[PDB]
Amino acid sequence: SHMEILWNEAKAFIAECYQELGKEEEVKDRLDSIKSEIDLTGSYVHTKEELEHGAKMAWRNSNRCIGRLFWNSLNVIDRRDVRTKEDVRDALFHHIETATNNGKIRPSITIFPPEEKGEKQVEIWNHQLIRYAGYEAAGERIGDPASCSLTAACEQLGWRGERTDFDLLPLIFRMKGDEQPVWYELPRSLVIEVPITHPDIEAFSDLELKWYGVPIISDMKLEVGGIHYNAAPFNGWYMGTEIGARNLADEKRYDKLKKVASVIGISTNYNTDLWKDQALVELNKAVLYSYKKQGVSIVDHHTAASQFKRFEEQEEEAGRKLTGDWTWLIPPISPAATHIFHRSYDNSIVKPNYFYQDKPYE
Amino acid sequence: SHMEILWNEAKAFIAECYQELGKEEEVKDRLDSIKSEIDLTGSYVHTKEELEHGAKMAWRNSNRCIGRLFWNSLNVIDRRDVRTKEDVRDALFHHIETATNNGKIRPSITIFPPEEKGEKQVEIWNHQLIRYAGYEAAGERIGDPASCSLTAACEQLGWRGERTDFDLLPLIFRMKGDEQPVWYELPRSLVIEVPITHPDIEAFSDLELKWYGVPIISDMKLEVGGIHYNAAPFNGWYMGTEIGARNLADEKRYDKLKKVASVIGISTNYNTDLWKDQALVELNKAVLYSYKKQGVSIVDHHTAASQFKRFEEQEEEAGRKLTGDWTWLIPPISPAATHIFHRSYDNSIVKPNYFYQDKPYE
Ligand code: HEM
Ligand code: HEM
Ligand SMILES: C[C@H](O)[C@H](O)C1=Nc2c(nc(N)[nH]c2=O)NC1
Ligand SMILES: C[C@H](O)[C@H](O)C1=Nc2c(nc(N)[nH]c2=O)NC1
Ligand SMILES: N=C(NO)NCCC[C@H](N)C(=O)O
Ligand SMILES: N=C(NO)NCCC[C@H](N)C(=O)O
């Protein structure tokens, strides 16, 4: 039944892809080759043009992403030639270096070899290539609680952290033919970090906060024409609220709102004073100012929504339908001040797209 | 087919209602009487206990309401005896007076006669009993844009406003047997209004803002045991954000954020400064402070979410399932700071409940 499903999805992808590219003539021929290949091996190999355009279409169909206006400018890195653990490590080191680009971040994706008979060639365990560790001793919390389970798995393999609130996790992945994964500590020269300060309030630095510069999701599956690429890291640039309103504010994460209120000089006695709302405004203002000072790319939520509006218009103009998830598109601060809040979206799934997959650990 | 549907809904309501009331014995008898009544007239008459408990259950099932913790304390006013236009006017005047209660607002509902053969006995045109008019001359906007259509209909009947930003609309309703509705100007002694000032910034009064004290939704249909009460006004008390983050902030309503930014001393040049988020915080703080000073009931969003949490727990403890609409339950300011944001809800419809109905005007 797997051979049937593969053929269906290949028929729809080739036609739609070559149509957008203006190569409708070649559709008839290529399909005959893919068909013969499927009967011969049980799968097919995408051309460079096909995989490159496929990863772009997948971003365009991501219902939960507010940055879809820049979909056609994605930088695609083809690494389907990797065979060893050293090959993977160097490619991952290269992704961080080129995407960072000394601060002027470049949206990118690295393509590793896909699954064969459902079996993987390379399996990445990290959620993001750069992330902080999390420990929960009987005493209290240290680090990022969302990293608990992955942190425990790394220490079960010989790794050991320093136990500060910001320990960098190591790269951890498994090669086909091995029962357990291998790990490599990240070189400090490759990772940019940004200390958090405030434009007018000098005491803000007493909190000693900081965050990393580039978010690189590395545990999702990219599906193109029936072919499953379980390993394919991708990155864009941060939207301010992700850090100041969630990562540092959530009670289940760093939980910093009370401390913020203290350094800015306001009381935390009464809810009618709305101290939580005021603390959120100063913290978020601090995140945008600090990233800009050091020259690292970032975007505020009002500018972001404005760009997404232009995206909706372009899609209508091109003749394509729009899909999206309202519950993820609205910003976590001042949502009613953007256009997104005042309209509705169709949350249907269209392929090619990016998908969630089960975690090896846990 | 209408006689069939009525019987079904009556069977489920009586059993469920008498069960909660601990009168399961009387279920067998009452059902036999209702059945005979339906064959005789084509409808049935609720007892005082049945209608009172029915309006309470309906509030408990309202997916979009965050104030459901106080459902069992609702004040029910039975006015199914009205026959003339003067009878309706006095009852509506009485609802505003008793619900206001000199500031200590009392959640209430007034029950008018229900529909017969789909035909209404009394039809209310107002959206809320107390609301401001809206005009849109070629010059610009004056008043509340959301009141445009209803305002035009009132002037088509002989009414005339003064054209300020806060003209009070008149009560307007139609009696069975008349082709057009009648109107009555509201007595100023019955309507409480609150001027908006700021606790620390004295220049805030230069904006000359104000809003009314009690929101009374009067155009929804209450359905209990197959019986349709198209006319049944109800009220609770305001949640701060409804006024400061929507009524006075939306670009399609009063659109005041830029003016607010001016009186507090901040610039509106750059989105990275987050001036819209800061203006929203001071305006909302002003609304809570002003209502309290004058002694009128109001609640902030953090306290409100906290109360709703206790509601979820009580429902679980009583053995009933929970239903709700996430998109309406989350507050329009700092949503990620409340528990509601971090969970999911089942948006199924359970009866008895309140429903939308077509507008006579427009
Ligand atoms: C160029 C700048 C980019 C910005 C400004 C941006 C911003 C966002 C934001 C705000 C979210 C929500 C994250 C959260 O709440 O945790 C998101 C989700 C997502 N974005 Fe982007 N993104 C960018 C680039 C990309 C790229 C390059 C891709 C893919 C090639 C992409 C695919 C998606 C997908 C699938 C999600 C959902 C993730 C999940 O379900 O956990 N985005 N993006
Ligand atoms: C006692 C205090 C009350 C508070 C604090 C409260 C608060 C709220 C809020 C914030 C909304 C959203 C309004 C909007 O976004 O426009 C709402 C909606 C609603 N509430 Fe309440 N409410 C109260 C009492 C009541 C009462 C007394 C009833 C019914 C007997 C009720 C029935 C509902 C319903 C059906 C909606 C949806 C209205 C719509 O769809 O337009 N609430 N309530
Ligand atoms: C996770 C669950 O679906 C829940 O709706 C939310 N979390 C998030 C959210 N929105 C964003 N962007 N990110 C989240 O983590 N909204 C909803
Ligand atoms: C009206 C439409 O359903 C849209 O989701 C919204 N308006 C509102 C909303 N939330 C509230 N409480 N009130 C609204 O007017 N969220 C959604
Ligand atoms: N802005 C982007 N992608 O470019 N974001 C991805 C998800 C990141 C996650 N919200 C974090 O704070 O780490
Ligand atoms: N808080 C309550 N009901 O008690 N609200 C009802 C809806 C009111 C509407 N949001 C307004 O601002 O007028």
PDB file of N, CA, C and O in Angstrom, chain B residues 76-105:
ATOM      1  N   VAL B  76     -33.817  36.664  38.683  1.00  0.00           N
ATOM      2  CA  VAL B  76     -34.811  36.490  37.613  1.00  0.00           C
ATOM      3  C   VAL B  76     -36.126  37.273  37.810  1.00  0.00           C
ATOM      4  O   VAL B  76     -36.845  37.051  38.786  1.00  0.00           O
ATOM      5  N   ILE B  77     -36.452  38.149  36.858  1.00  0.00           N
ATOM      6  CA  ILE B  77     -37.677  38.965  36.909  1.00  0.00           C
ATOM      7  C   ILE B  77     -38.740  38.490  35.900  1.00  0.00           C
ATOM      8  O   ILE B  77     -38.570  38.635  34.692  1.00  0.00           O
ATOM      9  N   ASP B  78     -39.836  37.938  36.415  1.00  0.00           N
ATOM     10  CA  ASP B  78     -40.936  37.407  35.596  1.00  0.00           C
ATOM     11  C   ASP B  78     -41.964  38.459  35.155  1.00  0.00           C
ATOM     12  O   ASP B  78     -42.778  38.916  35.962  1.00  0.00           O
ATOM     13  N   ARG B  79     -41.954  38.807  33.866  1.00  0.00           N
ATOM     14  CA  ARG B  79     -42.896  39.792  33.310  1.00  0.00           C
ATOM     15  C   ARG B  79     -43.712  39.243  32.126  1.00  0.00           C
ATOM     16  O   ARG B  79     -43.963  39.955  31.150  1.00  0.00           O
ATOM     17  N   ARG B  80     -44.135  37.985  32.217  1.00  0.00           N
ATOM     18  CA  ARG B  80     -44.914  37.368  31.156  1.00  0.00           C
ATOM     19  C   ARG B  80     -46.370  37.854  31.121  1.00  0.00           C
ATOM     20  O   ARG B  80     -47.172  37.400  30.306  1.00  0.00           O
ATOM     21  N   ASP B  81     -46.690  38.804  31.996  1.00  0.00           N
ATOM     22  CA  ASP B  81     -48.037  39.369  32.079  1.00  0.00           C
ATOM     23  C   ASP B  81     -48.258  40.652  31.263  1.00  0.00           C
ATOM     24  O   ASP B  81     -49.385  41.145  31.185  1.00  0.00           O
ATOM     25  N   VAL B  82     -47.196  41.186  30.651  1.00  0.00           N
ATOM     26  CA  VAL B  82     -47.296  42.426  29.867  1.00  0.00           C
ATOM     27  C   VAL B  82     -48.222  42.290  28.660  1.00  0.00           C
ATOM     28  O   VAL B  82     -48.221  41.274  27.996  1.00  0.00           O
ATOM     29  N   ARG B  83     -48.985  43.349  28.371  1.00  0.00           N
ATOM     30  CA  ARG B  83     -49.919  43.353  27.263  1.00  0.00           C
ATOM     31  C   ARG B  83     -49.893  44.606  26.393  1.00  0.00           C
ATOM     32  O   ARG B  83     -50.252  44.569  25.229  1.00  0.00           O
ATOM     33  N   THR B  84     -49.461  45.729  26.967  1.00  0.00           N
ATOM     34  CA  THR B  84     -49.409  47.009  26.246  1.00  0.00           C
ATOM     35  C   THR B  84     -47.995  47.577  26.116  1.00  0.00           C
ATOM     36  O   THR B  84     -47.055  47.074  26.737  1.00  0.00           O
ATOM     37  N   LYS B  85     -47.862  48.641  25.339  1.00  0.00           N
ATOM     38  CA  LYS B  85     -46.575  49.305  25.126  1.00  0.00           C
ATOM     39  C   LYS B  85     -46.113  50.021  26.394  1.00  0.00           C
ATOM     40  O   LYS B  85     -44.918  50.136  26.642  1.00  0.00           O
ATOM     41  N   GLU B  86     -47.067  50.502  27.193  1.00  0.00           N
ATOM     42  CA  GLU B  86     -46.735  51.171  28.435  1.00  0.00           C
ATOM     43  C   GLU B  86     -46.207  50.127  29.438  1.00  0.00           C
ATOM     44  O   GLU B  86     -45.326  50.432  30.256  1.00  0.00           O
ATOM     45  N   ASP B  87     -46.750  48.908  29.376  1.00  0.00           N
ATOM     46  CA  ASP B  87     -46.321  47.817  30.261  1.00  0.00           C
ATOM     47  C   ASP B  87     -44.853  47.471  30.016  1.00  0.00           C
ATOM     48  O   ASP B  87     -44.101  47.257  30.961  1.00  0.00           O
ATOM     49  N   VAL B  88     -44.468  47.401  28.739  1.00  0.00           N
ATOM     50  CA  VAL B  88     -43.091  47.079  28.336  1.00  0.00           C
ATOM     51  C   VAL B  88     -42.106  48.166  28.784  1.00  0.00           C
ATOM     52  O   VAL B  88     -41.064  47.864  29.381  1.00  0.00           O
ATOM     53  N   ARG B  89     -42.458  49.425  28.521  1.00  0.00           N
ATOM     54  CA  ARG B  89     -41.628  50.572  28.890  1.00  0.00           C
ATOM     55  C   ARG B  89     -41.316  50.628  30.384  1.00  0.00           C
ATOM     56  O   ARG B  89     -40.171  50.865  30.768  1.00  0.00           O
ATOM     57  N   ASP B  90     -42.334  50.449  31.219  1.00  0.00           N
ATOM     58  CA  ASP B  90     -42.145  50.484  32.665  1.00  0.00           C
ATOM     59  C   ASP B  90     -41.260  49.326  33.144  1.00  0.00           C
ATOM     60  O   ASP B  90     -40.460  49.494  34.061  1.00  0.00           O
ATOM     61  N   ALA B  91     -41.397  48.161  32.515  1.00  0.00           N
ATOM     62  CA  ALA B  91     -40.594  46.991  32.882  1.00  0.00           C
ATOM     63  C   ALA B  91     -39.122  47.211  32.510  1.00  0.00           C
ATOM     64  O   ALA B  91     -38.223  46.837  33.269  1.00  0.00           O
ATOM     65  N   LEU B  92     -38.879  47.818  31.343  1.00  0.00           N
ATOM     66  CA  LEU B  92     -37.519  48.100  30.884  1.00  0.00           C
ATOM     67  C   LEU B  92     -36.888  49.179  31.782  1.00  0.00           C
ATOM     68  O   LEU B  92     -35.701  49.095  32.131  1.00  0.00           O
ATOM     69  N   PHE B  93     -37.690  50.169  32.186  1.00  0.00           N
ATOM     70  CA  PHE B  93     -37.220  51.229  33.085  1.00  0.00           C
ATOM     71  C   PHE B  93     -36.839  50.588  34.435  1.00  0.00           C
ATOM     72  O   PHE B  93     -35.834  50.968  35.047  1.00  0.00           O
ATOM     73  N   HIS B  94     -37.637  49.613  34.870  1.00  0.00           N
ATOM     74  CA  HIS B  94     -37.408  48.918  36.139  1.00  0.00           C
ATOM     75  C   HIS B  94     -36.142  48.048  36.131  1.00  0.00           C
ATOM     76  O   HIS B  94     -35.464  47.958  37.146  1.00  0.00           O
ATOM     77  N   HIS B  95     -35.818  47.443  34.987  1.00  0.00           N
ATOM     78  CA  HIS B  95     -34.625  46.593  34.861  1.00  0.00           C
ATOM     79  C   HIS B  95     -33.362  47.435  35.075  1.00  0.00           C
ATOM     80  O   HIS B  95     -32.482  47.057  35.849  1.00  0.00           O
ATOM     81  N   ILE B  96     -33.291  48.581  34.411  1.00  0.00           N
ATOM     82  CA  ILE B  96     -32.139  49.471  34.543  1.00  0.00           C
ATOM     83  C   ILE B  96     -31.966  49.969  35.984  1.00  0.00           C
ATOM     84  O   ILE B  96     -30.852  50.012  36.493  1.00  0.00           O
ATOM     85  N   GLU B  97     -33.072  50.315  36.644  1.00  0.00           N
ATOM     86  CA  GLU B  97     -33.003  50.809  38.017  1.00  0.00           C
ATOM     87  C   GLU B  97     -32.537  49.767  39.042  1.00  0.00           C
ATOM     88  O   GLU B  97     -31.635  50.036  39.837  1.00  0.00           O
ATOM     89  N   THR B  98     -33.134  48.581  39.011  1.00  0.00           N
ATOM     90  CA  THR B  98     -32.780  47.518  39.960  1.00  0.00           C
ATOM     91  C   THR B  98     -31.418  46.845  39.706  1.00  0.00           C
ATOM     92  O   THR B  98     -30.735  46.437  40.647  1.00  0.00           O
ATOM     93  N   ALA B  99     -31.018  46.746  38.441  1.00  0.00           N
ATOM     94  CA  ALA B  99     -29.732  46.140  38.090  1.00  0.00           C
ATOM     95  C   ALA B  99     -28.583  47.076  38.476  1.00  0.00           C
ATOM     96  O   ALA B  99     -27.523  46.623  38.925  1.00  0.00           O
ATOM     97  N   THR B 100     -28.803  48.378  38.304  1.00  0.00           N
ATOM     98  CA  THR B 100     -27.810  49.397  38.641  1.00  0.00           C
ATOM     99  C   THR B 100     -27.552  49.405  40.146  1.00  0.00           C
ATOM    100  O   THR B 100     -26.398  49.380  40.590  1.00  0.00           O
ATOM    101  N   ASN B 101     -28.638  49.407  40.918  1.00  0.00           N
ATOM    102  CA  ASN B 101     -28.573  49.402  42.379  1.00  0.00           C
ATOM    103  C   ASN B 101     -27.540  50.383  42.947  1.00  0.00           C
ATOM    104  O   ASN B 101     -26.651  50.004  43.712  1.00  0.00           O
ATOM    105  N   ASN B 102     -27.658  51.637  42.530  1.00  0.00           N
ATOM    106  CA  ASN B 102     -26.785  52.730  42.952  1.00  0.00           C
ATOM    107  C   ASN B 102     -25.279  52.457  42.810  1.00  0.00           C
ATOM    108  O   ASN B 102     -24.464  53.086  43.487  1.00  0.00           O
ATOM    109  N   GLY B 103     -24.918  51.544  41.908  1.00  0.00           N
ATOM    110  CA  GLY B 103     -23.500  51.221  41.688  1.00  0.00           C
ATOM    111  C   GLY B 103     -23.098  49.776  41.934  1.00  0.00           C
ATOM    112  O   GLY B 103     -22.250  49.248  41.205  1.00  0.00           O
ATOM    113  N   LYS B 104     -23.643  49.159  42.986  1.00  0.00           N
ATOM    114  CA  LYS B 104     -23.355  47.759  43.305  1.00  0.00           C
ATOM    115  C   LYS B 104     -24.245  46.914  42.386  1.00  0.00           C
ATOM    116  O   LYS B 104     -25.302  46.423  42.799  1.00  0.00           O
ATOM    117  N   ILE B 105     -23.813  46.765  41.136  1.00  0.00           N
ATOM    118  CA  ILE B 105     -24.556  46.035  40.114  1.00  0.00           C
ATOM    119  C   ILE B 105     -24.977  44.612  40.477  1.00  0.00           C
ATOM    120  O   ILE B 105     -24.199  43.844  41.059  1.00  0.00           O
TER     121      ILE B 105
END
